[PDB]
Design a protein around this ligand. Structure first.
Ligand SMILES: O=C1N(Cc2ccc(CO)cc2)[C@H](Cc2ccccc2)[C@H](O)[C@@H](O)[C@@H](Cc2ccccc2)N1Cc1ccc(CO)cc1
Lengths: 99, 99
């Protein structure tokens, strides 16, 4: 799916039987995601980006549906104010930054 | 220029006769950039993302060359550990997130 709209390319993601807006974060290397409803079987970690380091849960193997398209990947669940989709997911949906 | 390489789409940008690695961050809305020497003419501000809020300088009208291509835009110079290229710049180089 092409997504330009000279604005934030957000995609309705479907993780842990849930749906939220995801900020296509081609900048991040993984798909972070504000706290949500995910089952255990994950690993505790912390990302360090702009402002400070937040705590998230590396959920490897999460069927996140972006753009009505199935896409499993590592979703980090933490206190992030946005559902970040990094390369870990831009590689499953085949996202490409052509400019 | 198409950039997938299932990894971080970094691009050597040339801002104010300067050059650094820019993490193509379609997630951000503007082009943040670790502290550096910009062409003056800017305003003090602070972005609030992952971890906390960092302080940057909205440098509006900065000739940032991405992919050997000239591209003026708003480069926020602050204590960011990376040169983020948000939509503000993904709209000048005509970037498109297709997956
Ligand atoms: O912290 C941000 N991370 C941090 C981050 C770390 C780890 C992951 C998962 O691996 C994802 C995101 C990225 C930028 C960055 C990456 C690495 C080092 C330094 C910076 C991201 O790529 C960017 O999209 C937004 C995400 C965001 C945006 C809004 C609200 C919450 C989170 N930010 C913050 C940001 C804020 C404003 C601008 C300018 O508009 C740019 C970035």
């Amino acid at each position: 799916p092409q997504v330009t709209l000279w604005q934030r390319p957000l995609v309705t993601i479907k993780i842990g039987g849930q749906l939220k807006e995801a900020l296509l974060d081609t900048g991040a290397d993984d798909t972070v995601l504000e706290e949500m409803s995910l089952p255990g079987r994950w690993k505790p970690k912390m990302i360090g980006g702009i402002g400070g380091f937040i705590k998230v849960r590396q959920y490897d193997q999460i069927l996140i549906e972006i753009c009505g398209h199935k896409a499993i990947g590592t979703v980090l669940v933490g206190p992030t104010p946005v559902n970040i989709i990094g390369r870990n997911l831009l590689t499953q949906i085949g996202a490409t930054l052509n400019f």
